[PDB]
């Protein structure tokens, strides 16, 4: 149909376009590379072609698909690995003998090879149905049906034909819909453009616990179900590490991992590691992976795949939420997504803003976060779901004022830090309290108090300790440890202990084991207890030396507690933590008189 | 007086070290890094207007 | 057709529209000399070429253009070691010719097949600070961050030469079972540098071990960018077709980045942060993506890029970008160099986040990783104490701090201090490392698991 | 030929310019001003005209010279002051009654009044002769090697006409060469474009030093021919002195002095001073100037000549390298050559990189360093010659953290730190052992050990002693010198003699700033023997006061070492040092016992 007028860089101009929508997907040239229409100048439409071009001729054919860059939502997304332009990566390996994308491959959006078992819904013939309703379900996992087959949004009618229970393939018809005669047939998959968010019934308040399973978050600033999060940091920050832990431990029923332009070895590691390791609520065959789907993309792999990653992933997440699942979406990193834009603004010749990144940055990040939150699912059964977004970014040389980090921080309500100095001693991730806040902290403590722990009371003293520690440390540096008071010495020690035992997730035998809110609470009871009794003791006359040497064993025990597997009496209160409480009491008394 | 001098010299030896080692390179790194970012915003603008 | 005009490294051709992107063209000068270039931008009845070779002398209707009608691919053979080549797709040194059994593209996806399975095999440099504190794997990417007062070439050569002697000791251990190949590419460095490198490889072993691509600073920036691409084709073939582990030493990586910077200055392309391109991310990526295990899973390409920092800052765009992408960071310090430590590698900010992938356990200890973390932690405390020793004096520092100041001094002068040909096995390094840990008491070593400390002390 | 389309500033565009190369020398207008075509857009050539384009209407003719802008290489270089694109300043003084060249005044690069005596080589008609082979020579010097005439590089053939012995003019033909009909005629000079490096048989690394004749250069970190070196700027209260002294004291076969874009006080000083001063090896006929060829630009000269300045000088240096000579290129300053690039960029409209300096900067420096170095000279019986670049890089932002300095140091392997406080007090040179380095040390120290000196032992030890002295000096301030051993006091005592004699040399006296490379080694020998013996003797029972009285006469001699003559029987073995050694051994038995 159209004919290539020019290729200047990855940017292609082709005449004989009478139309085309925004960001319309095309297959360009005989090669059949990915593209999207960004703009139209005259009859000539400028289309960026984002798969590497080293050999596209002028006057090669241009085929419009007729709809924007879109995603399929349907059966077999779980335990199936995809790119950001929704090509199954497994399908490519077999055919192509190119494990990664080579230049010029056209592989359909889903797997049309794997038959799936369809069972019929509470909607039988003659019944009205509307988008996001559970028309049926597909068995995908050993424990649960993952993919609840939804009628798509922006479709409606009464069902003339319901296919019976049995096996069918993806392209075969299984549903016929009545509304102005045959409105159309439906297939197992449905399509949606990824620049349109999916519509919900209502959004609902975020105040319900999100257990990410990592001690350091639970202790300092927990997230919420419905959360939005920013995390900075630059290599040796433990972001890959916290993703793997996050996937294993996560209470959410789906986790969607987004690789924005990753090392490739990093993607190779996490893929291998989900079936090698076991889940905490049990998992039969590829345990963790059963709950994990990967969108993975490397650093030179298509600029479209990388740009679309956050939208392909957020659309997936919204679909699981409309299904009635709790989703934890990890994107890593939005900063690598931001580089895809920096590149897009130069090529096109549009004028950018500061740091050579465009101004449209701020809108695009904001749109992604607002589609997240906790909501009541669209569809007649009605369920509760969430999309809680944890989004990684990277500072430009210790500069946190770079447009990407500042923008994400603008939109977020939770900020979790990352300190370079503390990572060097091996404490990554490294969250303090002067580089981090959470608005959810206040409601979240109220909900944890209820469940069992004393957390809110301990949280306040814990915050104070860290806040004083920093200030007191500046005096040690400059003046020396000769200007201190004895209570201030106490604040320094307890603090050093907190730094190691929560923030560090680095091994010494084994990478640290699942620590819940309950575990995390016990650690806090022992550190806070140490501090109170010791200050009383010094106030009331007593040696510093006597008190520190005496705590001794108790300190070794809390350090290593996290390596030991949870439950050692109970999850709730361990016998190992219970006993220390007595030891402090016995010491306090010896010291006083 | 002699005991009094000994106590003061120690506070004084501490300060002479403190200024050189901590303060002076903290001022240097902050001034130069902000100078470099500040000039960048200004230069790119000229290039965009020109383009 | 004929040259229309020339504006810097960009050449304006008035031509006809049949050419494809990166299709080779040859510029015929009136001297009758041919130089090669590839079309960077094509439009109707015209082209913009960037010429690899030269950038001046280009005429109008006295000059002519001829089309090759093949977009650039590198002629790759597996008989490339020992053979001298020049960074231009052919030797202009008059060295043994390249030959071709495949011609492979440098776009960054020819047929590219990489890691679906992460590195697990340890590869040693014979140097303790590298191996123990960070570890190197059969796909690991580690940047050598160097300076204008450090001698970058001496360290570059040091790491490579000593990793060739260790690597067959590791073959016998059954860490490996396949060949070792070196691919050395020097791009746009001085003559003095180029000569030096070749001399170094000969002394240690031979130059049969390595393949050489030589590019001279007097040759353009456009040449310099193609120079690593040539290295990548060499390495991917060897891994793919003949199940060899390939080690690439890419010097200087900074040289390549400045080149990118030049084709946005004498282009109308608006640059990003600190005058470095906006599409700088993609240019760098191309080198780093083409790494990891190669299909069959006995072949590999492992990367050690060599960066020289000009300002020596960690706010400069080149060191920052590289670091996020690469699997490790090795920081080499001017202050150690001055003091008389060779190698003078500071591990204070050397970090790997893919620390697990980097270490080995089936041809290295399991204790290797546990000890390294503790060492790093104890080094760091020893640095905090060093600043405090200058300020406060010894007139208020604590009993615990004193152990940490001693550890710091013993650590620089024993662990990081090694002979020019003295190679240490990874197991022997543990014994050395255990000597360093041994002065601290069992209550200072509290962070480590009890099991390990009672076992090995 | 072409017709002027526009004159917008000093940039002039011209149409109807075909077969116009991209380095093409052109003469603009009726006046014939020098210009060169930087760019071409279409039919129109964009020219930077270096001279004032005042009086130039649109429609004036543009006449191609028909070839790039080249420089002439041949007889009658030495004892001439030149422009940045080689135009004799001296010749303008005769004609014009001007120092400088004013607009509309051009002249040829070599004088045609002067005639030189051409002597044939070892090739006669009918012989095949090859690129660079020695076709003849001219002798016009007796103090140094003269201008040996080569067959032009990249030129081969059989010689139809070899002119016999006699005087010919530089202009006049002396060769016709048969290579595809008459190849052309050639003359006594050859033209070479200066933005093209000259070939040589092969280039090698450096290994070969020569007489620097400034003690501090050799002693602290050796000075090598075929080297790359950075020297700090001072803007003529410190810069000028070291430059004048390096030209005068170094008895390198040639010296090529390039002032890139200087104050004009410094240019004025170097020209008047060179005939006035005496050679350090004997001979008259304007001593130092006869060895010197000068390119002298103040900042006032055209900007293309300032940019060109180093390129022309480097070609000059490279030409003499094929004759087999050792050259010092002393260039002052690269920051000022860099300033030209910045100016030329803004005029074109080129977008630069950091601090306003282009991106052509880093590659142009790398290309520049490599032209300089050691090489086996081209020409049939082969010789060795070298080109050593010492380039000053001054403040360009008021710091040394600016792009010009930081780029160069990296390619450079040598830094020599001038000291300001000592420089303001007029000790020149006074190089700081703290900041300085040479990466050439190793290969060189092995070279001198071969030749006859004990050089590796003494140089290394020189450095250690001084470094050590700063650290011991601090123990004297804070604890006291009285509580410290005799050994430590000695370490300092010796460092002060090493500092006084070498480092604090005065380039206003020739018995205090001119001594041969052997002589400089003999002085250093003297101090080291004393250090060891002094530490040996205090251990066997001596004191600082006792030691000082006892050494006496040898200590006084070492203090007086610099005042001594460059010879005593030979200028390579100074008999007074060899006998001093005996007096030291005899003194050590007496002192100790």
Swiss-Prot record, chains A, D:
GO cellular component terms given for this protein: fungal-type vacuole membrane; Golgi membrane; proton-transporting V-type ATPase complex; vacuolar proton-transporting V-type ATPase complex; vacuolar proton-transporting V-type ATPase, V1 domain
Molecular function via GO: ATP binding; DNA binding; endonuclease activity; mRNA binding; proton-transporting ATPase activity, rotational mechanism
Q: Which InterPro entries match?
A: ATP-synt_VA_C, ATP-synth_a_Xtn, ATP_synth_asu-like_sf, ATPase_a/bsu_AS, ATPase_F1/V1/A1_a/bsu_N, ATPase_F1/V1/A1_a/bsu_N_sf, ATPase_F1/V1/A1_a/bsu_nucl-bd, ATPase_F1/V1_b/a_C
Phosphothreonine PTM sites in chain numbering: 107
Membrane topology designation: Peripheral membrane protein
Q: Where in the cell is it found?
A: Vacuole membrane
Resulting phenotype, residue 260 to S: Reduces splicing reaction speed. Inhibits splicing
From the Swiss-Prot or TrEMBL record, give the protein name.
V-type proton ATPase catalytic subunit A
What organism does the record attribute this protein to? Saccharomyces cerevisiae (strain ATCC 204508 / S288c) (Baker's yeast)
Q: By which gene is this protein encoded? A: VMA1
Curated annotation (Swiss-Prot), chain B:
Q: Which domain of life is it from?
A: Eukaryota
| Localization, UniProt | Vacuole membrane
The protein's job, in short, is: Subunit of the V1 complex of vacuolar(H+)-ATPase (V-ATPase), a multisubunit enzyme composed of a peripheral complex (V1) that hydrolyzes ATP and a membrane integral complex (V0) that translocates protons. V-ATPase is responsible for acidifying and maintaining the pH of intracellular compartments.
Q: How does it assemble?
A: V-ATPase is a heteromultimeric enzyme composed of a peripheral catalytic V1 complex (components A to H) attached to an integral membrane V0 proton pore complex (components: a, c, c', c'', d, e, f and VOA1). Interacts with RAV1 and RAV2 components of the RAVE complex, which are essential for the stability and assembly of V-ATPase.
The record's family statement is: Belongs to the V-ATPase D subunit family.
The note filed under miscellaneous reads: Present with 8500 molecules/cell in log phase SD medium.
Question: What is the name attached to this protein's record?
Answer: V-type proton ATPase subunit D
List the source organism.
Saccharomyces cerevisiae (strain ATCC 204508 / S288c)
Query: What residues of the intact protein does this structure contain?
Result: 155 to 205 of 256
Swiss-Prot record, chain C:
Any GO CC annotation of this UniProt entry: fungal-type vacuole membrane
Miscellaneous notes: Present with 131000 molecules/cell in log phase SD medium.
Q: Where does ATP bind?
A: 353
Q: Which PROSITE patterns match?
A: ATPASE_ALPHA_BETA
Q: Which UniProt keywords apply?
A: ATP-binding, Hydrogen ion transport, Ion transport, Isopeptide bond, Membrane, Nucleotide-binding, Phosphoprotein, Transport, Ubl conjugation, Vacuole
* Residues that bear Phosphoserine: 109
Q: What is its main location?
A: membrane
Q: Per the UniProt entry, what species is this protein from, by scientific name?
A: Saccharomyces cerevisiae (strain ATCC 204508 / S288c)
State the Gene Ontology terms under molecular function.
Answer: ATP binding; proton-transporting ATPase activity, rotational mechanism
Gene Ontology biological process terms from the UniProt entry: ATP metabolic process; endosomal lumen acidification; Golgi lumen acidification; intracellular calcium ion homeostasis; pexophagy; proteasome storage granule assembly; proton transmembrane transport; transmembrane transport
Q: How does it assemble?
A: V-ATPase is a heteromultimeric enzyme composed of a peripheral catalytic V1 complex (components A to H) attached to an integral membrane V0 proton pore complex (components: a, c, c', c'', d, e, f and VOA1). Interacts with RAV1 and RAV2 components of the RAVE complex, which are essential for the stability and assembly of V-ATPase.
Protein name from the UniProt record = V-type proton ATPase subunit B
Q: What does this protein do?
A: Non-catalytic subunit of the V1 complex of vacuolar(H+)-ATPase (V-ATPase), a multisubunit enzyme composed of a peripheral complex (V1) that hydrolyzes ATP and a membrane integral complex (V0) that translocates protons. V-ATPase is responsible for acidifying and maintaining the pH of intracellular compartments.
Q: Which gene encodes it?
A: VMA2
Q: Where located?
A: Vacuole membrane
By sequence similarity, the record places it as follows: Belongs to the ATPase alpha/beta chains family.
Q: Name the Gene3D superfamilies for this protein.
A: 3.40.50.12240
Q: Which domain of life does the UniProt lineage start with?
A: Eukaryota
């Amino acid at each position: 149909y159209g004919a290539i007028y020019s290729v200047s860089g990855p940017v292609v101009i082709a005449e004989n376009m009478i139309g085309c929508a925004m960001y319309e997907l095309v297959k360009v040239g005989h090669d059949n590379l990915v593209g999207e229409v960004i703009r139209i100048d005259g009859d000539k439409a400028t289309i960026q072609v984002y798969e590497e071009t080293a050999g596209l001729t002028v006057g090669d054919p241009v085929l419009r698909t007729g709809k924007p860059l879109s995603v399929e939502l349907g059966p077999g997304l779980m335990e199936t690995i995809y790119d950001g332009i929704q090509r199954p990566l497994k399908a490519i390996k077999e055919e192509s003998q190119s494990i990664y994308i080579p230049r010029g491959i056209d592989t359909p959006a889903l797997d049309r090879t794997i038959k799936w078992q369809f069972t019929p819904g509470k909607f039988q013939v003659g019944d009205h149905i509307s988008g996001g309703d559970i028309y049926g379900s597909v068995f995908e996992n050993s424990l649960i049906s993952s993919h609840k087959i939804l009628l798509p949004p922006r479709s409606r009618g009464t069902i003339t034909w319901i296919a019976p229970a049995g096996e069918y393939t993806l392209d075969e018809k299984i549903l016929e819909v009545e509304f102005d005669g045959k409105k159309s047939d439906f297939t197992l998959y449905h399509t949606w453009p990824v620049r349109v968010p999916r519509p919900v019934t209502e959004k609902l308040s975020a105040d319900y616990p999100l257990l990410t399973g990592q001690r350091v978050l639970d202790a300092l600033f927990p997230c919420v179900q419905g959360g939005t999060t920013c995390i900075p940091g630059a290599f040796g920050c433990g972001k890959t590490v916290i993703s793997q832990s996050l996937s294993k431990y996560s209470n959410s029923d789906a986790i969607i991992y987004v690789g924005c332009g990753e090392r490739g070895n990093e993607m190779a590691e996490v893929l291998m590691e989900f079936p090698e390791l076991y889940t905490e609520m049990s998992g039969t065959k590829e345990p963790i992976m059963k709950r994990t789907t990967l969108v993975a993309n490397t650093s030179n792999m298509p600029v479209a795949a990388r740009e679309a990653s956050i939208y392909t992933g957020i659309t997936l997440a919204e679909y699981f939420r409309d299904q009635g699942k709790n989703v934890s979406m990890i994107a890593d990193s939005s900063s690598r997504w931001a580089e895809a834009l920096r590149e897009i603004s130069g090529r096109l010749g549009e004028m950018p803003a500061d740091q050579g990144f465009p101004a449209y940055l701020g809108a695009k990040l904001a749109s992604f976060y607002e589609r997240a939150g906790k909501a009541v699912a669209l569809g007649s059964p009605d369920r509760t779901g969430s999309v809680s977004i944890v989004a990684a970014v990277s500072p430009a040389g210790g500069d946190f004022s770079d447009p990407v980090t500042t923008a994400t921080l603008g939109i977020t309500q939770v900020f979790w830090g990352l300190d370079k100095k503390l990572a060097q001693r091996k404490h990554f991730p490294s969250i303090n309290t002067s580089v981090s806040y959470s608005k959810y902290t206040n409601v979240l403590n109220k909900f944890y108090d209820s469940n069992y722990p004393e957390f809110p009371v301990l949280r306040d003293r814990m915050k104070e300790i860290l806040s004083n520690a920093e200030e007191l440390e500046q005096v040690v540096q400059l003046v020396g440890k000769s200007a201190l008071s004895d209570s201030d010495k106490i604040t320094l020690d307890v603090a050093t202990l907190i730094k190691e035992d929560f923030l560090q997730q680095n091994g010494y035998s084994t990478y640290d084991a699942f620590c819940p809110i309950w575990k995390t609470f016990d650690m806090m009871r022992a550190f806070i207890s140490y501090h109170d009794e010791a200050q009383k003791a010094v106030a009331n006359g007593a040696n510093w030396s006597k008190l520190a040497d005496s705590t001794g064993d108790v300190k070794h025990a809390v350090s290593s507690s996290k390596f030991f597997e949870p439950s050692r009496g109970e999850k709730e209160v361990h016998g190992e933590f219970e006993k220390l409480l007595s030891t402090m009491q016995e010491r306090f008394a010896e010291s006083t008189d | 007086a002699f005991i009094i001098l000994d106590e003061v010299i120690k506070v004084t030896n501490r300060r002479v070290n403190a200024i050189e080692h901590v303060i002076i390179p903290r001022t240097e790194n902050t001034i130069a890094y902000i100078n470099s970012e500040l000039d960048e915003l200004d230069r790119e603008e000229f290039y965009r207007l020109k383009k | 057709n004929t040259v229309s005009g020339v504006n810097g490294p960009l050449v304006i051709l008035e031509k006809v529209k049949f050419p494809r992107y990166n299709e080779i063209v040859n510029l015929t000068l009136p001297d009758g000399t041919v130089r090669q270039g590839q079309v960077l931008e094509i439009r109707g009845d015209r082209a913009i070429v960037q010429v690899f070779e030269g950038t001046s002398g280009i005429d109008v209707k006295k000059t002519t253009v001829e089309f090759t009608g093949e977009s650039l691919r590198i002629p790759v053979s597996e008989d490339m070691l020992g053979r001298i080549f020049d960074g231009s797709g052919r030797p202009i040194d008059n060295g043994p010719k390249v030959f071709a059994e495949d011609y492979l593209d440098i776009n960054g996806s020819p047929i590219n097949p990489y890691a679906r399975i992460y590195p697990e095999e340890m590869i040693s440099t014979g140097v303790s600070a590298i191996d123990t504190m960070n570890s190197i794997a059969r796909g690991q990417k580690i940047p050598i961050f160097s300076a204008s007062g450090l001698p970058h070439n001496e360290i570059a050569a040091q790491i490579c030469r000593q990793a060739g002697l260790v690597r067959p000791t590791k073959d016998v251990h059954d860490g490996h079972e396949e060949n070792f190949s070196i691919v050395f590419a020097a791009m746009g460095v001085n003559l003095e540098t180029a000569r030096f490198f070749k001399q170094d490889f000969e002394e240690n072993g031979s130059l049969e071990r390595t393949s050489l691509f030589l590019n001279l600073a007097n040759d353009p920036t456009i040449e310099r960018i193609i120079t690593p691409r040539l290295a990548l084709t060499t390495a991917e073939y060897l891994a793919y077709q003949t199940e060899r582990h390939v080690l690439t030493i890419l010097t200087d990586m900074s040289s390549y980045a400045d080149a990118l910077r030049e084709v946005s200055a004498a282009r109308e392309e608006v640059p990003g942060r600190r005058g470095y391109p906006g599409y700088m991310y993609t240019d760098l990526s191309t080198i780093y993506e083409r790494a990891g295990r190669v299909e069959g899973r006995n072949g590999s390409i492992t990367q050690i890029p060599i960066l020289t920092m000009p300002n020596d800052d960690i706010t400069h765009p080149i060191p920052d970008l590289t670091g996020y992408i690469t699997e490790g960071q090795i920081f080499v310090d001017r202050q150690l160099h001055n003091k008389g430590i060779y190698p003078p590698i500071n591990v204070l900010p050397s970090l790997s986040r893919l620390m697990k992938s980097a270490i080995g356990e089936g041809m290295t200890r399991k204790d290797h990783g546990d000890v390294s973390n503790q060492l790093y932690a104890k080094y760091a405390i020893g640095k905090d104490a060093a600043a405090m020793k200058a300020v406060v004096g010894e007139e208020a520092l604590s009993i615990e701090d004193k152990l940490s100041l001693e550890f710091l001094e013993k650590f620089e002068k024993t662990f990081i201090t090694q002979g020019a040909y003295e190679d240490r096995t990874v197991f022997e390094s543990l014994d050395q490392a255990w000597s360093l840990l041994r002065i601290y008491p069992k209550e200072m070593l509290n962070r480590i698991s009890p099991k390990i400390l009672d076992e090995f002390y």
